[PDB]
Design a protein around this ligand. Structure first.
Ligand code: CDL
Ligand code: CDL
Ligand code: NDP
Ligand code: ZMP
Ligand code: SF4
Ligand code: SF4
Ligand code: SF4
Ligand code: ZN
Lengths: 169, 114, 186, 182, 90, 35, 90, 384, 208, 137
């Protein structure tokens, strides 16, 4: 018997399943401006899920996601990955946190460890401290503890970073 | 239980079935031009399967004026499909895209509230 | 003076009814207007004379164009001079609202008044027609002078009771002046 | 809200300046990217070219900012017929069910950056045909909208107020600072 | 901390801390009117009258509420149902 | 030029009603109550 | 006074226009006053206190159902006909 | 070459989809696709009362506002057997003529933008903004005034409105002459407007043409004189009649309509009676606010007529007045309740646009652009 | 004197009454009933088999040149056996008059197209077909003129809902404007504006 | 004068009335046209309202906003009492008109706060209607 958290009858599941309905899920899709984020935002908005949607860059890269949900089901929030208080402000009223934060190349501000390892662990521990019921995190298929190079030297840092980030999550 | 009315586009059920077969023949000939001239994900075989499904959906009807009404609306949709007035979104309205399949069992409808 | 092709009656006026002139003076005049662009010269002169005219550009937003005391803008909820809110929850405005933007939910207050618990106007649904202020028995709902209330976000145009009461508090002087200068017309 | 500052209080306040970021950046590269973004936003807000997208009555007021009294041309604003050459699309009218793929295709062929102004109650929220069988309930379900101009036929001062609010949004755009912090 | 979220309105409404609907106020201000009508109508004094029936207009004639007549034979304060002004007979 | 038809027809295919509304909706025929 | 050019540019503009130019923009002295005294609306025909009954002037209740023109001749009987006067539009 | 003059295209009014088949520059076929601005007006009228369905007509043909409100008001008044006062008749006549000039300014500016001369568009839209300021003074909105009501007008005229209308109408004729100095008898405008879209008399009679399309071809039919309405029989004016039936004769007829509307405006400001604005049947018109806040029967009638509409007797009528586009008709059928059972709108632009398939054949592309420029179509009332 | 009551025009009453008896005498096969309504408007109530031969007659006769056809109007009254009625409004410029020709039509039963008589019926008879499903036989092309290309159903029937059955929204997965079942954010508030007291005693027994 | 030489000294006295040449430069850079007018009003917020009937209608009255803000001005800085004066509803300024209420509960004017972190966001104003049952008590 799985118990309910708050039993607020303005917060339970209602409706048939369109945009105007509510399925009792408050999603916080981190990195929702990306490739998987667009499809998961439209799939969440077609069912009636309110999304908080924290964005890091400009508002023009994230303002296209207002057409996925209904009125009031789409929010926006400015955050940095190194800043923990903004993440705690983002996930303080949520029960489902979806983590799509990842980067295929090293950046001058964020390395692989600063995105996949440290950032996902920080998001997971902030969501655990904020009372989030469920967290969804994405990794790679071929993650190993010590993955070997095949063609390029210095490769498979991404797979090791995703495996270490999954272990810290 | 019998009234005398003015026939619309037919005088007998065999003639109405023959004109429905004309409609199906013209739709079947217009399938590969619809797949070619529209930017739709559905292929030729999927379009033919959808055409067969929409015909066997209306298989159940019996009345001459009702089946002639269906033939008239089908020819109007076909004329909207030969001359390209419908869009790629109007063609893909036959396949129920962006719609979650509603369950038929009582337990899933009881959990979801339907 | 060219002759009439069709005889013009008393109650009508005819355009392109003149005969084409065939005397040599009019043919030479039309020929010189064709060859030397005389009518185009008149059009160019009429065009060039409007450069020297005063520009009608009213230089927004330092200088704003004329309005009227009857002007329909942002809906707002007024108050009595004593301070009690005017809206007695009588729901003629929602009954008369043609786009059905107004939603009213009313309960009895602690002292026994009729005043609302919910008064919402969807300004994305409101057509600014002014039927609510005519159908208001007290002068509660009113069309304020404000029209510079463009919003960045769709939900911010869903006006609550507190937003309408804040609009009534903010715009009370101009609304009261317009209602003082306009009540005898209505 | 906030109370607008009294002139006794406001005389002690310093001048705001043109830049919303301020000239108090620490790094010289951050300051250079801030001034480059200020110049880029000045060039973008100095000329936005809206598209001739007039669906219904609201557009009769849209030509009234073309009109000599209000004169949109001294704000960088001039109409362009082709969607490639245009920055802004002004949804001025009633978006219907047959109008939806045309508006979506015209918006998708427009090149990015793309700011959208919803002009009028039919453009945002559906309005006076909100319960109609063949009217889309606002254009926010199809095209992402940055400015929403409220009036049923917006006065032309209010449409130009939406244009100035879009210019303030364009002046507040942070691209190179976000690139430095990405 | 922000004190504009937990502040109650004049309709007795506040979003509690376990509600999901307070996430809409993390980037926008919650608008609560500080001019309540109850205190602003309790602040005015009652009007003393000598005649048995009185009329309340609420202000100016065409700019006030429709005219009502209140009977002041019962002891106590009689409240106008339109404006909320209280009359009393000595 | 007249034909023979039954007087009871079914106009549910030629109308715009979907299957999910024609298969499970109950219609109440009633006199409305006096206030 | 009015905001206008010097008379040289005035005569150049009047020569290029081909007519005597009048100003196309309104001015404050050439317009009506924005503030103005309150009006009184005159009463109509039925605002008299005496001899006004509604049934004598009842517009909605004098509407009858349409007359069957075939049966009107049958119940009243117990130059070709035109639907109107001839208008010459030529 | 199949081609779409789609809704983006500026010669189209923003929702017209002309699917045209072209052999070179000539137009072999032209099928107009409409209903891109269909908003379901007639489905939405039946769920609302009469005074709630009054602002639909402002949005139907939106360059003829007061004419549409006048036509709906005459429909409801003919159903109710209610006679408006003379001051209301003169106010509605003056605002219908102001509306006629506004519509023909929009027609001339749109046709000149489609042909190419973009200067008289702004030259006349300054004048159009001055009349929209007049609408704003009299009602409170620059357009969709909601000012003409069944039973008269909603509000009285403000003081000193005619003291601005007279100065404006005195100044309008020089602007008219300045427009004809650049548009009339310019040879390029003649080459884009002469012998183009020739409509014969039997064409306009059989194809349901009305208004200027009747009077371009030579038919002397003006509905303000044949079937008079709202003090149009107490004013005197001339009717512009064309001969050739091309775009030039229709353009000259429209500018001559703007010229004759000035003398109708002059007569309306010259004679205006001092009296009431609404009919005094308080069960069909809302009472004054002083009577509503003072008397009991006026408060009851204000309450009733602003909750559930006035009971129109059951019956059918079809009124039709002279719109600036043509003949604007309301077929209003009432079942005796507070809501109309049926309100069918005859727009003249629908019947004008229905002959575009025959007129546009064997014409060029700029010919067809000038034809929609001279057809004077507004697709809000066409799509209804 | 009553100045708040509209006075009828007697010269538009006598001429229209004589013409109504004239058109009842000239066409007894099709005309069932002619009636002069309040507001001085003449209605002719024809059989559905006489749509073309009546509207041709009023087009081409010397005593009735109703050469202009302003509008064809469909009214859906679902109580009757033949639910739709079709109203042709004709204007006579020569005699300066108007007539209304009304017929009854069911959705399955076709109607004669007046496109051979008046060419405005090329489009107006499409519009009723787009809004009621009244099939007009021997029409040039009977297409869908006002509603969307993928629209299923006729919207102006009283058995059709006000908000429709479906809505449209942009799907960025399919990259197109897709069709969804209807869910309104705020429902249409149906107001019960019914009069419990009758106000017209002249229309009490107007049904037989 | 016939030629128009006397408008040059009007431009010169515009420059001197602006406060110099640099102040006239920043007045022309900020206010899009240079004008002279009688100072009618000064707000509590620091705006200045000038009127001069020499210009035509629609341009004879202008606001110059408070000098603590540059480039962030908009049309919502005008308060409620001067809104009818700037929009030609009345011809009476609040310094002469006494018809304005000036009540105690009148809130001060605020600009359009949309697009910032302090804008208005709607919410349900009624409390909860259905009260649930708590197994406790
Ligand atoms: C990498 C390096 C950086 C690259 C990117 C640079 C972006 C610059 C643009 C920008 O957005 O700056 C915002 C940025 C932020 O400004 P701010 O500090 O927020 O606002 C300043 C004041 O508070 C508010 O401004 P203000 O009110 O003081 O007025 C600004 C300006 C007056 O405004 C202007 O000058 C604007 C430009 C008008 C040009 C008109 C002619 C154009 C001709 C085109 C051909 O004032 C002056 O220049 C001083 C008075 C001059 C009197 C002249 C009298 C002549 C008689 O501006 C600066 O940082 C200013 C310094 C850098 C600019 C370049 C200075 C050196 C070159 C000068 C011109 C040489 C020729
Ligand atoms: C023998 C040759 C005789 C002259 C032939 C040309 C005559 C036509 C002509 O230029 O008329 C303009 C002007 C007459 O003014 P208007 O166009 O009849 O009326 C203007 C309104 O009254 C304006 O309204 P308002 O009453 O407010 O006027 C006050 C103020 C209004 O001020 C503003 O609106 C703001 C101006 C800001 C200027 C900022 C930059 C200043 C740079 C220095 O007006 C001005 O500032 C007038 C400026 C005129 C500049 C003219 C330049 C002509 C160049 C050669 C053309 C050939 O004539 C002159 O200024 C003549 C002197 C030209 C420069 C001589 C230098 C030594
Ligand atoms: N081929 C694939 O797509 C595969 C993906 N995955 C995993 O799936 C997940 C999602 O992938 P996908 O959407 O396709 O990739 P993207 O790179 O396209 O999206 C990543 C998202 O995270 C944001 N982001 C990136 N770096 C940071 C940072 N340092 N701080 C905060 N936000 C940041 C991006 O924002 P912005 O808009 O600024 O770029 C973007 O919204 C990732 O975890 C990835 O490792 C695994 C296997 C295969
Ligand atoms: C996009 C690509 C195409 C997608 C599918 C589009 C479908 C378009 C057609 C759908 C609308 C129609 O016309 S269906 C109605 C046609 N009528 C019928 O099906 C009636 C069926 N009744 C019959 O008697 C026959 O026609 C059979 C049963 C089909 C023929 O008889 P056989 O002797 O079995
Ligand atoms: S009509 Fe006026 S008093 Fe009545 S409910 Fe509406 S706003 Fe309140
Ligand atoms: S102005 Fe009209 S649309 Fe707006 S709230 Fe009032 S009645 Fe409704
Ligand atoms: S919002 Fe109002 S003015 Fe604009 S298109 Fe709709 S009805 Fe017309
Ligand atoms: Zn009181």
């Amino acid at each position: 018997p799985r118990p309910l958290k708050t039993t607020n009858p303005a917060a339970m599941k209602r409706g048939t399943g369109g945009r105007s309905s509510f399925n009792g899920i408050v999603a916080t899709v981190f990195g929702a401006t990306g490739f998987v984020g667009r499809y998961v935002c439209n799939k969440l908005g077609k069912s009636g899920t309110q999304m908080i949607l924290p964005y890091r860059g400009d508002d023009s890269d994230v303002i296209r996601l207002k057409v996925t949900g209904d009125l009031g089901q789409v929010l926006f929030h400015f955050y940095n990955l190194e800043d923990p208080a903004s993440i705690r402000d983002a996930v303080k009223h949520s029960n489902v946190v979806i983590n799509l934060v990842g980067r295929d190349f090293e950046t001058k501000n964020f390395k692989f460890k600063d995105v996949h390892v440290n950032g996902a662990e920080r998001i997971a521990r902030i969501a655990r401290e904020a009372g989030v019921e469920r967290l969804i995190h994405l990794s790679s298929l071929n993650v190993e503890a010590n993955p070997k190079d095949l063609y390029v030297k210095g490769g498979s840092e991404w797979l090791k970073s995703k495996y270490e980030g999954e272990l810290r999550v | 239980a019998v009234q005398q009315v003015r026939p619309i586009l037919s005088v007998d059920r065999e003639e109405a079935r023959k004109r429905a077969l004309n409609l199906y023949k013209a739709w079947y000939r217009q399938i590969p031009y619809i797949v070619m001239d529209y930017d739709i994900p559905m292929t030729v075989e999927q379009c033919r399967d959808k055409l067969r499904e929409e015909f066997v959906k209306h298989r159940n009807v019996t009345d001459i004026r009702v089946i002639d009404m269906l033939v008239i609306k089908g020819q109007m949709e076909l004329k909207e499909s030969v001359e390209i007035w419908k869009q790629k979104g109007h063609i893909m309205r036959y396949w129920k895209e962006s719609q979650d399949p509603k369950p038929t069992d009582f337990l899933s409808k009881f959990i979801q509230g339907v | 003076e060219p002759k009439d092709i069709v005889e013009v009656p008393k109650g009508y006026v005819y355009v392109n009814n003149k005969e084409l002139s065939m005397e040599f003076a009019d043919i030479t005049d039309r020929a010189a207007s064709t060859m030397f662009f005389g009518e185009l010269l008149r059009g160019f002169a009429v065009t060039l004379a409007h450069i020297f005219k005063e520009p009608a550009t009213i230089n927004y937003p330092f200088e704003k164009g004329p309005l009227s005391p009857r002007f329909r803008g942002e809906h707002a909820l007024r108050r009595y001079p004593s301070g009690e809110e005017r809206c007695i929850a009588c729901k003629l405005c929602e009954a008369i609202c043609p786009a059905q933007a107004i939603t009213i939910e009313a309960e009895e207050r602690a002292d026994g008044s009729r005043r609302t618990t919910r008064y919402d106007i969807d300004m994305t649904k409101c057509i600014y027609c002014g039927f609510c202020q005519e159908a208001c028995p007290v002068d509660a709902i009113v069309e304020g002078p404000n029209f510079e209330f463009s919003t960045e976000t769709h939900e911010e145009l869903l006006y609550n009771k507190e937003k309408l009461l804040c609009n009534g508090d903010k715009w009370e002087s101009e609304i009261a002046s317009n209602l003082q200068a306009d009540h005898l017309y209505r | 809200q906030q109370t607008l500052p009294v002139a006794e209080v406001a005389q002690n306040l310093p001048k705001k300046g043109y830049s919303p970021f301020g000239t108090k950046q620490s790094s010289v590269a951050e300051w250079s990217l801030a001034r480059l973004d200020d110049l880029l936003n000045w060039g973008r807000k100095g000329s936005i070219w809206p598209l001739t997208f007039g669906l219904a009555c609201c557009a009769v007021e849209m030509m009234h900012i073309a009109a000599p009294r209000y004169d949109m041309d001294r704000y960088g604003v001039v109409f362009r017929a082709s969607p490639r050459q245009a920055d802004v699309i002004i949804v001025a009218g009633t978006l219907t069910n047959k109008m939806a793929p045309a508006l979506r295709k015209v918006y998708d062929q427009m090149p990015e950056p793309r700011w959208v102004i919803s002009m009028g109650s039919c453009a945002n929220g559906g309005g006076y045909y909100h319960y109609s069988y063949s009217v889309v309930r606002g254009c926010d379900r199809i095209i992402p909208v940055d400015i929403y101009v409220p009036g049923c036929p917006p006065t032309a001062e209010a449409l130009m107020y939406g244009v100035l609010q879009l210019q303030k949004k364009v002046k507040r755009m942070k691209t190179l600072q976000m690139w430095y912090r990405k | 901390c922000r004190g504009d979220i937990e502040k109650v309105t004049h309709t007795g409404q506040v979003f509690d801390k376990e509600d999901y609907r307070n996430a809409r106020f993390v980037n926008a201000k919650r608008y609560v009117n500080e001019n309540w009508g109850i205190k602003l109508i309790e602040e005015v004094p009652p009007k003393e009258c000598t005649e048995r029936v009185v009329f309340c207009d609420g202000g100016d004639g065409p700019l006030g509420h429709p005219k009502v007549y209140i009977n002041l034979d019962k002891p106590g304060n009689h409240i106008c149902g339109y404006c909320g002004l209280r009359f009393v007979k000595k | 030029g007249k034909i023979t038809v039954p007087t009871a027809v079914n106009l549910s295919p030629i109308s715009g009603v979907p299957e999910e509304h024609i298969r499970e909706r109950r219609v109440r025929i009633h006199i409305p109550p006096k206030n | 006074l009015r905001r206008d050019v010097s008379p040289l540019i005035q005569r150049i503009r009047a020569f290029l226009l081909g007519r005597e130019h009048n100003l196309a923009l309104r001015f404050e002295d050439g317009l009506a006053d924005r503030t103005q005294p309150q009006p009184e609306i005159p009463d109509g025909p039925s605002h008299l206190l005496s001899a006004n009954y509604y049934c004598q002037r009842d517009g909605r209740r004098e509407v009858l159902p349409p007359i069957d023109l075939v049966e009107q001749q049958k119940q009243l009987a117990a130059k070709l006909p035109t639907p109107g006067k001839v208008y010459a539009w030529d | 070459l199949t081609l779409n003059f789609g809704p983006q295209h500026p010669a189209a009014h923003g929702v017209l989809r002309l699917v045209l088949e072209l052999d070179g520059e000539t137009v072999m076929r032209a099928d107009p696709h409409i209903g891109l601005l269909h908003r379901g007006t007639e489905k939405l009228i039946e769920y609302k009362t009469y005074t709630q369905a009054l602002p639909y007509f402002d949005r139907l043909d939106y360059v003829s506002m007061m004419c549409n409100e006048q036509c709906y008001s005459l429909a409801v008044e003919k159903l109710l057997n209610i006679d408006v006062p003379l001051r209301a008749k003169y106010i509605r006549t003056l605002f219908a003529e102001i509306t006629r000039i506004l519509n023909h300014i929009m027609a001339v500016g749109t046709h000149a933008l489609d042909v190419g001369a973009l200067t008289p568009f702004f030259w006349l839209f300054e004048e159009r903004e001055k009349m929209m300021e007049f609408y704003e003074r009299v009602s409170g909105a620059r357009m969709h005034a909601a000012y003409i009501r069944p039973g008269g007008v909603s509000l009285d005229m403000p003081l000193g409105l005619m003291d601005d209308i007279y100065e404006f109408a005195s100044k309008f004729a020089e602007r008219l002459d300045e427009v004809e100095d650049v548009l009339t008898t310019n040879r390029i405008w003649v080459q884009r407007t002469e012998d183009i879209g020739i409509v014969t008399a039997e064409e306009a009679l059989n194809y349901g043409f009305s208004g200027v399309m009747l009077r371009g071809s030579g038919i002397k039919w003006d509905l303000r004189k044949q079937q008079p309405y709202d003090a149009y029989n107490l004013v005197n004016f001339d009717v512009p009649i064309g001969t050739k039936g091309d775009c030039y004769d229709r353009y000259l007829c429209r500018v001559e309509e703007m010229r004759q509307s000035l003398r109708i405006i002059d007569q309306c400001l010259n004679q205006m009676p001092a009296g009431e604005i609404k009919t005094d049947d308080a069960k069909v018109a809302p009472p004054s606010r002083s009577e509503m806040k003072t008397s009991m029967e006026a408060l009851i009638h204000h309450f009733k007529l602003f909750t559930q509409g006035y009971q129109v007797p059951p019956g059918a009528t079809y009124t039709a007045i002279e719109a600036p586009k043509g003949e604007f008709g309301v077929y209003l059928i009432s079942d005796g309740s507070s809501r109309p059972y049926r309100c069918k709108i005859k727009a003249p632009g629908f019947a004008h646009l229905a002959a575009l398939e025959k007129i546009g054949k064997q014409h060029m592309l700029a010919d067809v652009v000038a034809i929609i420029g001279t057809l004077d179509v507004v697709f809000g009332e066409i799509d209804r | 004197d009553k100045p708040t009551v509209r006075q009828p025009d007697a010269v538009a009453r006598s001429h229209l009454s004589d013409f109504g008896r004239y058109v009842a005498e000239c066409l007894p096969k099709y005309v069932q009933k002619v009636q002069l309504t309040a507001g001085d408007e003449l209605e002719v109530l024809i059989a559905p088999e006489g749509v073309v031969p009546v509207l041709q007659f009023l087009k081409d006769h010397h005593q009735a040149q109703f050469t202009n056809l302003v509008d064809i109007a469909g009214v859906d009254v679902p109580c009757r056996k033949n639910r739709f009625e079709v109203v042709y409004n004709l204007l006579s410029l020569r005699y300066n008059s108007r007539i209304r020709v009304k017929t009854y039509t069911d959705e399955l039963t076709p109607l004669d197209s007046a496109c051979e008589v008046h060419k405005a019926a090329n489009w107006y008879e499409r519009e009723i077909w787009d809004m009621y499903g009244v099939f007009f036989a021997n029409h040039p092309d009977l297409r869908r003129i006002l509603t969307d290309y993928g629209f299923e159903g006729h919207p102006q029937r009283r058995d059709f809902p006000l908000s429709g059955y479906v809505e449209l929204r942009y799907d960025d997965e399919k990259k197109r404007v897709v069709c969804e079942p209807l869910e309104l954010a705020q429902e249409f508030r149906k107001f019960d504006l019914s009069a419990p007291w009758e106000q017209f005693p002249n229309f009490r027994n107007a049904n037989p | 004068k016939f030629l128009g030489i006397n408008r040059l000294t009007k431009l010169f006295q515009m420059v001197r009335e602006a406060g110099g040449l640099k102040q006239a430069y920043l007045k022309l850079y900020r206010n899009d046209d240079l004008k002279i007018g009688t100072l009618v009003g000064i707000d509590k917020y620091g705006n200045k309202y000038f009127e001069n009937p020499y210009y035509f209608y629609g341009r004879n009255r202008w606001i110059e906003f408070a000098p603590h803000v540059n480039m962030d001005y908009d049309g919502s800085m005008i308060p409620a009492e001067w809104y009818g004066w700037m929009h030609y509803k009345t011809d009476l300024p609040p310094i002469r008109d006494g018809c304005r209420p000036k009540y105690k509960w009148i809130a001060d004017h605020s600009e359009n706060l949309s697009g910032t972190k302090e804008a208005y966001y709607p919410y349900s104003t009624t409390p909860n209607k259905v009260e649930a049952w708590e197994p406790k008590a």
